[PDB]
Design a protein around this nucleic acid. Structure first.
Lengths: 145, 75, 74, 60, 72, 209, 478, 57, 202, 60, 151, 144
RNA sequence: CUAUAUUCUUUG
């Protein structure tokens, strides 16, 4: 079964399963009409990395920054658009996402939905709404600073 | 030639009685003839007016008469 | 001329006699017992399709004066 | 006047070309003796129009 | 030996087939049948052994009328 | 022989599936790619190859004047300066719609204009070139020895009337490499096909004839 | 009156593009406006949703292994998703087959599998089917799972290599995936190896659906429906294309009248004939409207009553159906108040030409009982998407649907066949944008003649009246 | 180099009149354009990636 | 550390060996170990990879194969090839309508608008950017007569409905008729009307 | 192979995804591998192919 | 008989359509190398890509050879051009593998033991490795049929 | 959210020489900021986004004109290949467009994509190559 | 070459 296995990554920060797509192996696939409102974002990883102090002796920060640099190389930011990247500080640019799939409106008025309260502290619910190295965020939730 | 097979018992480009083989009349030739001043724009242009205005020669004329082809004309 | 005169059959004409300029007989039904036997055999020969009533001969000319367009832009 | 345009040419070939360069083209015979057993590629290398050899073209 | 594998779905499509020495051998009393691509249907169908020189669409090649369960 | 594998499963955009298990007991596309019995499928079998599209050909009944050919006339150290290329083309479409247009200079999709006259006054051109009775400009492309159907071609210029040698002395500048010959009625340019005909016509139109 | 030919007005515009194109246009114009409403599935969708998850489902089928050449088989009972599949299979150009589930066994299932030879099977586990208890129609939950495992026994014998063997059933070798649709009310998603990815960007540089849609043509047939009264032995499932469906929908939406955000109902169990499959949802798509599904089925008194109680809530300004299930509404509409129907104004019933002629006293009964302004009757053969000619209650004359020519010809010609004498039985030929000349069979996709004049053979014989009226017949058997 | 067609491809005769159809001075891999990234975000470091080797050299 | 067979051996076989040939002890096997795939070890996303991952059948030089599978089988092959050529021609013409209409920012209409194609032929630098029309300009009507409305003039006779500007004639003729010729057949092919017929003077 | 410039062109080829081509040991005795034994295994005939290709497999 | 030859100059760029070598059925003299396809019945070598053809000789037996096609032409071109330039400037080293007189030594000083690695017969127990290695995933490939060293 | 502001927004590079179209105060401020910053970033992070309707409302609410994605090239080539007649790909003459004669013995030469022109290509040594360009900007084949 | 094969395939 080493030749028959569904691909499992350890770092989904690129959310590759949205891009590199492998067919469901099962002969019976289950497709409801309900699953259109399900956002398919990757599962919450262990070692939430954005909490890490970027200490030069810290192993998890080392492996994370080499991961980020390799992601930058595979998307060709690092050689190309941005030739020299010193990785010093641990950066998190987070967005107030509601995880709503498409753009919505108000049922009560017909207005655009009001701007959400800016996020105070980072949470696990907030994790995929950040800017990671390589991932995908919906346009509908990127609407605010 | 006997190494090559026969095709289509009459022959490939074969004339028969009633094959419609038109001699071409290019639309460019016509428009040149009109803007040059051989032919009336004011008038229904028949094959007769083409023969009389000399734009097409007697030799070119054969049954069935002509085809109007647009060669290098976009308007 | 096609859309006014030609595409319409004779006003009396039945379906079988449609193509004739004047209907050769009155009744549309085949009027000869031999012709009727032949039409029965024709309708069981070809399976029973709508047009099978009218006899079409099994053999062909392969002549260019009867052939029309195989396929092309309408 | 047309004596030499013999029809055994006109059944076999057909000439294709722009003025001052014209091939005579023909199909291949290997066909009507043994089709089966050979292979499909060498069989359908027979369905293409091909220019005759230039000597024969000059000769005809 | 030379036989013709002609479509069991009767399109009259035949394919020249050379029998293997086992099938060339008279050991068995059967016609060979094989699943092949029928281009006339663009589908896979059974082919049957039949004589190469003979009309590939014969009258006797008509299937009896079968009513289909589907529909009313 | 168990026929199976992960090939039937569609993998889009990169195949991340373990690659040791792709085809099992089934011939790969590589196995049929190194084993085909045909040979050298032709260069025209390349479907996605971007093929050229020719421009509209200059015929005697269609003057489609190309600006670049005209620019290659304008680079030459010719005397007798030429009308700028915008004038050799007929008036536009949407300008010519109504009855507001003149009779001589009318809109023609083929394009045809009566001769514009010399691009400079106070100057005399030593030669004068006549259009045909149908409006065609004099250059004719023949073949030397047409019986054997030789590809070798030439150009015959007839309707030149004047000092023909001035015509030839500018024709030298147009055709530096080719062979030029003079005769009472005509001027021969050798090894010049419809290209040089197109040029001769661009030059004669630009010159004011 | 003199000759047998009938023609409709040609002033109505014709839509010749693909389906996805009009979906994109209608998604750009009205994005947030409602498209269809279903209470029993909790589906309230905009045009946003229909575009988004249509092409999302398209990508889903692309990764599930579907390709532009092959077929899908769909036994779904009156869902939204069979329509969504119409659009998805339209986008990737795969022929969708919808078969009626009301009488379904293992034998005819394997007949369908023999006929269409589908790549996919869109099925259920528990499906609701009518059956007769004590002379009365009662619902049964047919366990369709049993039927699938009866048709294909080899899925039970499971050896620990066999998700990946090449052929899942040696006797159906064209079956690759089976899409099971059941609403499982658990909040947790299913494991991604039985679930197809329906969300997010499927690409980097460009999405491959618009690389594909350039290679698709509007006359490519994608849909197939049963003909319960087949013209001939041969025509089994008559087959529809992009522009057939689009123009059926647009002609219906133009002829009645439909304005944006106006509510448009459909009686259930019509997804297998071109009523709720083709005419209705494409009418709702093409012009701005809101499609409305009433209760999932019809055939019993209880959910007939539930049907009225839903349609009076949902504020439907007009609805579609057939005579046979308007019978049930007429049974149970008397029990309610008159003013409860105050929003219903017009109603539509569709007629196959072998019915002939729903009586106008029945129409009068409908109009008086529901407090209706007008009752519209459409009629035509099933090849024509149930519209050739139509009448209202107040107008008994049969007006032709625009861009439709119906002629009755002799037997001695193809293109050059001659019009008969306006009472005489002869072949029938239909020319129209929403008419289909293809039909799917055991052999494969098939087509009867479309000639130089543009007309199309139906292989049906008919009789024309003096007043516009068609009567279909079986083939002439002397 | 013997044979008839080797006589035709050297004296380059009427099938071979332009011999090798793959000849030096065409490259399919780069199409004679230099792969250098001038696309750099800040205009200061524009020439930062230069002399990145195309092969072992 | 290392083992003499290299992998830690499972208890089933073990307890099976030291209770000689008996498996009653652990028979419920643990699931296999996972192999994690490095997502940044993957190559950069390629365009051609995106082109061909779908594996369409249209890149074959034999013909438009995808076209054949979307087309009826009821037609003789030599009349079907020139049919599929016609649909693959219309897909091209429409592709060009898309292109030129996008190039001028005009909403799509197809046979073609003239003024768009010809005027876009007058600019070599117009190939850079394309702009969408506004949502106001977008309508469903893709025929010009549906779009441009009536204009004042018409030439063809009014008595014929087939000449109506909005009339719809089907796009291609489809005939079930067989083809009459093939190369491997000796006497086949379409004959002059006064030529001798097949097998005459037997 | 028949390209589209042929005289006759054929229909769609078989889709590769269905009914694959097995990699079979060549039965030609000169092309057969040496160690390949003529497969006599005395067995009760299992008539369905589903099980009969499991016998050719070791997955335990 | 017939004469069966090279249709291209070795060391010269070649298009896919052109044949490389026509062999005669005897293992063939020339075997398909990188980006090269052999016609199984004809044993005629074709080019897969468009590039420079070169000949490899097997280190084991010099008489058995491969034809390779190297995809990028300009690499080979400017490498060869510079190399030649250096040859004329007396600045080039003759120690490269391009020198045919030196390749034996070159294979020798890199891997001295390649003789005894070729002559070394594995036993059946390490040819046929116990499949549970492959099952558990200690080794990811199980390939009993490569017992032979082709270099 | 202005217009010129958006133009300068879309064409931004970091240490630019001169910036035109913006008001002077903002230019001076950007000059200050870019004098302050080093060319080297201390952290880089990036996400990806798919189109939605908020793009449209961004362009239409501000009265701008939304950019479009150009159609594919290879799809155009595929369509252009499959559209042409079978007689467009056959051999039309003794000479391939290169000028080489095609003797009928070799199957590679039984196809011709571009029609050969015998009466053209005599002027190419005396002319600039820009003349060789076709209608779509691809050089057409001339006899040499 | 003449006959038998009459759809994309076939004999002497």
């Amino acid at each position: 079964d080493t030749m028959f296995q569904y691909p499992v990554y350890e770092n989904e920060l690129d959310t590759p399963h949205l891009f590199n797509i492998t067919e469901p192996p099962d002969f019976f696939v289950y497709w409801n009409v309900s699953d259109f409102e399900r956002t398919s974002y990757p599962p919450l990883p262990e070692e939430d990395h954005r909490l890490l102090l970027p200490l030069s002796g810290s192993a998890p920060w080392k492996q994370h920054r080499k991961r980020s640099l390799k992601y930058l190389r595979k998307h060709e930011i690092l050689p190309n658009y941005l030739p020299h990247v010193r990785q010093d500080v641990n950066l998190s640019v987070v967005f107030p996402g509601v995880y709503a799939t498409r753009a919505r409106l108000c049922e009560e008025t017909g207005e655009p939905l009001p701007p959400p309260p800016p996020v105070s502290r980072m949470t696990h619910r907030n994790f995929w709404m950040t800017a990671h190295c390589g991932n995908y965020i919906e346009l509908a939730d990127l609407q605010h600073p | 030639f006997m190494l090559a097979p026969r095709v289509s018992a009459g022959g490939p480009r074969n004339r028969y009685e009633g094959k419609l083989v038109f001699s071409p009349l290019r639309l460019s030739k016509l428009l040149w003839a009109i803007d040059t001043g051989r032919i009336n724009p004011n008038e229904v242009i028949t094959l007769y007016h083409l023969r009389q205005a000399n734009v097409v020669g007697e030799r070119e004329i054969v049954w069935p008469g002509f085809v109007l082809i647009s060669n290098g004309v976009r308007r | 001329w096609y859309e006014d005169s030609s595409k319409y059959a004779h006003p009396a004409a039945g379906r079988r006699y449609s193509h004739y300029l004047k209907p050769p007989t009155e009744r549309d039904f085949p009027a000869t017992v031999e012709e009727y036997e032949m039409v029965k055999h024709h309708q069981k020969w070809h399976l029973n399709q709508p047009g099978t009533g009218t006899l079409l001969p099994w053999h062909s000319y392969n002549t260019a004066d009867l052939v029309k367009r195989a396929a092309g832009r309408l | 006047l047309a004596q030499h345009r013999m029809q055994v040419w006109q059944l076999r070939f057909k000439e294709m070309g722009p003025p001052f360069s014209r091939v005579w083209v023909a199909l291949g015979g290997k066909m009507r003796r043994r089709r089966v057993g050979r292979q499909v590629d060498v069989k359908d290398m027979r369905y293409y129009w091909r220019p005759i050899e230039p000597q024969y073209q000059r000769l005809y | 030996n030379m036989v013709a594998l002609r479509s069991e779905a009767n399109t009259g499509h035949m394919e020249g087939y050379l029998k293997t020495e086992t099938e060339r051998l008279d050991a068995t009393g059967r016609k060979v049948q094989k699943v092949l691509w029928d281009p006339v249907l663009q589908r896979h169908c059974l082919f049957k052994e039949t004589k190469i020189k003979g009309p590939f669409m014969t009258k006797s090649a008509i299937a009896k009328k079968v009513d289909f369960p589907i529909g009313g | 022989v168990w026929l199976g594998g992960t090939a039937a499963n569609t993998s889009l955009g990169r195949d991340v599936m373990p690659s040791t298990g792709k085809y099992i007991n089934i011939v790969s596309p590589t196995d049929v790619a190194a084993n085909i019995s045909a040979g050298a499928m032709p260069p025209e079998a390349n479907v996605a190859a971007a093929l050229p599209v020719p421009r509209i050909q200059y015929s005697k009944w269609n003057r489609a004047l190309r600006s670049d050919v005209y620019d290659e006339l304008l680079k030459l150290p010719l005397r007798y300066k030429l009308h700028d290329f915008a004038k050799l083309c007929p008036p536009q479409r949407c300008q010519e719609e109504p009855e507001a247009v003149g009779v001589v200079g009318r809109d023609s999709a083929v394009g045809y204009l009566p001769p514009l006259g010399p691009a400079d006054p106070l100057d005399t051109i030593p030669f004068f070139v006549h259009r045909s009775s149908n409006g065609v400009l004099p250059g004719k492309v023949f073949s030397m020895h047409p019986r054997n159907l030789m590809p070798a071609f030439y150009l015959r210029i007839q309707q030149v009337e004047g000092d023909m040698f001035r015509f030839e002395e500018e024709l030298l500048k147009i055709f530096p490499t080719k062979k030029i010959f003079v005769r009472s009625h005509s001027i021969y340019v050798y090894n010049v096909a419809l290209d040089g005909r197109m040029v001769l016509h661009h030059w004669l139109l630009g010159l004011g004839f | 009156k003199d000759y047998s030919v009938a023609s409709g007005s040609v002033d109505t515009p014709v839509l010749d593009q693909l389906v996805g194109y009009y979906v994109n246009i209608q998604s750009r114009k009205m994005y947030y406006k409602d498209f269809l409403r279903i209470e029993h599935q909790a589906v309230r969708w905009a045009f946003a949703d229909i575009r988004k998850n249509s092409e999302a489902l398209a990508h889903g089928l692309l990764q599930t292994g579907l390709r532009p050449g092959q077929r899908v088989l769909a036994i779904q009972p009156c869902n939204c998703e069979t329509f969504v599949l119409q659009l998805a299979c339209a986008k990737i150009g795969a022929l969708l087959a919808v078969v009626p589930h009301h009488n379904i066994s293992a034998d005819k299932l394997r007949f369908y599998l023999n006929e269409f030879q589908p790549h996919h099977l869109i099925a259920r586990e528990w499906i609701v089917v009518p059956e007769v208890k004590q002379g009365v129609l009662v619902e049964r939950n047919m366990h369709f799972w049993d039927m699938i495992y009866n048709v294909i026994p080899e899925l039970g014998l499971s050896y620990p290599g066999q998700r990946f063997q090449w052929v899942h059933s040696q006797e159906f070798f064209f079956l690759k995936k089976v899409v099971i649709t059941d609403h499982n009310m658990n909040l947790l998603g299913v494991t991604p190896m039985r679930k197809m990815l329906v969300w997010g960007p499927f690409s980097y540089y460009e999405q491959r659906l618009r690389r594909l849609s350039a290679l698709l043509h509007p006359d490519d047939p994608i849909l197939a429906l049963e003909d319960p009264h087949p013209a001939l032995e041969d025509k089994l499932h008559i087959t529809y294309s992009h522009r057939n469906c689009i123009n059926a929908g647009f002609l219906f939406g133009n002829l009645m009248g439909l304005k944006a955000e106006s509510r448009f109902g459909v009686m259930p169990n019509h997804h297998v004939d071109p009523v709720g499959a083709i005419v209705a949802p494409y009418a709702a798509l093409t012009t701005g409207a809101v499609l409305v599904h009433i209760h999932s089925d019809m055939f019993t008194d209880d959910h007939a009553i539930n049907g009225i109680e839903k349609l009076c809530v949902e504020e439907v300004v007009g609805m579609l159906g057939k005579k046979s299930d308007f019978d049930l509404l007429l049974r149970h509409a008397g029990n309610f108040d008159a003013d409860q129907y105050e929003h219903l104004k017009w109603v539509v019933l569709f007629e196959d030409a072998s019915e002939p002629t729903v009586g106008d006293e029945y129409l009068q009964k409908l109009a008086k009982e529901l407090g209706l302004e007008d009752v519209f009757v459409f009629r035509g053969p099933l090849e024509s998407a149930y519209m050739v000619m139509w009448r209202s209650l107040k107008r008994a004359r049969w007006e032709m649907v625009p861009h439709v020519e119906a002629k009755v010809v002799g037997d001695r010609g193809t293109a050059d066949a001659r019009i008969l004498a306006a009472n005489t039985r002869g072949n029938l030929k239909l020319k129209g944008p929403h008419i289909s000349a293809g039909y799917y069979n055991n052999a494969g996709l098939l087509t009867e003649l479309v000639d130089e004049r543009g007309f199309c053979s139906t292989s049906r014989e008919a009789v024309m009246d003096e007043r516009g009226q068609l009567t279909l017949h079986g083939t002439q058997l002397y | 180099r013997t044979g008839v067609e080797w006589y035709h491809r050297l004296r380059r005769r009427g099938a071979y009149r332009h011999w090798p159809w793959a000849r030096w001075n065409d490259d399919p891999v780069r199409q004679h354009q230099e792969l250098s990234c001038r696309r750099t975000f800040s205009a200061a470091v524009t020439g930062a990636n230069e002399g990145v080797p195309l092969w072992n050299y | 550390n290392r083992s003499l067979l290299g992998y830690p051996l499972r208890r089933a076989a073990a307890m099976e060996m030291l209770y000689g040939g008996i498996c009653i002890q652990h028979l419920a096997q643990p699931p296999f170990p996972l192999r994690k795939i490095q997502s940044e070890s993957l190559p950069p996303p390629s365009l051609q990879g995106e082109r061909d991952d779908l594996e369409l059948e249209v890149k074959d030089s034999t013909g438009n194969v995808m076209g054949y599978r979307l087309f009826p089988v009821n037609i003789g092959i030599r009349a079907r090839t020139e049919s599929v050529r016609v649909r693959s021609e219309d897909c091209y013409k429409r592709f060009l309508a898309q292109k030129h209409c996008a190039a001028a920012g005009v909403p799509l209409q197809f046979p073609a608008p003239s003024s768009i194609t010809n005027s876009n032929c007058l600019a070599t630098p117009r190939a850079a950017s394309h702009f969408h029309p506004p949502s106001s300009s977008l309508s469903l009507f893709t025929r010009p007569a549906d779009s441009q409305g009536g204009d004042v003039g018409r030439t063809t006779p009014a008595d014929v409905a087939a000449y109506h500007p909005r009339a719809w004639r089907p796009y291609q003729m489809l005939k079930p008729m067989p083809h009459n010729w093939g190369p491997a057949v000796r006497s086949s092919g379409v004959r002059g009307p006064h030529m001798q017929l097949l097998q005459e003077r037997i | 192979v028949l390209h589209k410039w042929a005289v006759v062109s054929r229909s769609a080829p078989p889709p590769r995804g269905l009914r694959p081509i097995a990699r079979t040991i060549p039965t030609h005795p000169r092309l057969r591998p040496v160690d390949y034994k003529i497969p006599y295994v005395l067995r009760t005939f299992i008539k369905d192919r589903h099980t009969s290709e499991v016998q050719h497999l070791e997955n335990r | 008989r017939k004469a069966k030859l090279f249709h291209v100059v070795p060391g010269t760029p070649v298009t896919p359509f052109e044949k490389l070598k026509e062999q005669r059925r005897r293992l063939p003299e020339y075997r398909p190398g990188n980006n090269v396809r052999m016609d199984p019945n004809t044993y005629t070598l074709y080019a897969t890509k468009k590039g420079v053809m070169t000949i490899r000789e097997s280190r084991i037996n010099p008489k058995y050879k491969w034809l390779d096609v190297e995809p990028d032409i300009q690499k080979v071109y400017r490498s060869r051009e510079l190399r030649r330039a250096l040859q004329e400037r007396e600045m080039a080293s003759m120690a490269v593998g391009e020198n045919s007189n030196y390749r034996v030594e070159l294979d020798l000083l890199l891997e001295p033991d390649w003789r005894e690695r070729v002559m070394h017969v594995p036993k059946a127990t390490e040819r046929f490795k116990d499949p549970n290695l492959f099952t558990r995933g200690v080794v990811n490939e199980l390939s009993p049929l490569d017992r032979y060293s082709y270099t | 959210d202005s217009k010129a502001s958006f133009a300068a927004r879309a064409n931004f590079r970091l240490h630019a020489q001169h910036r035109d179209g913006i008001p002077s105060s903002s230019v001076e401020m950007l000059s200050r900021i870019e004098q302050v910053l080093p060319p080297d970033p201390s952290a880089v992070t990036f996400f990806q986004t798919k189109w939605d309707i908020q793009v449209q409302e961004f362009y239409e609410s501000r009265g701008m004109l939304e950019p479009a994605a150009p159609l594919d090239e290879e799809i155009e080539a595929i369509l252009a290949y499959h559209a042409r007649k079978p007689s467009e790909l056959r051999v039309r003459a003794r000479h391939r467009p290169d000028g080489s004669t095609n003797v009928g013995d070799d199957p590679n030469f039984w196809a011709q994509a571009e029609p050969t022109r015998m009466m053209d290509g005599s002027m190419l040594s005396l002319w600039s190559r820009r003349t060789t360009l076709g209608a779509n900007g691809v050089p057409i084949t001339y006899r040499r």
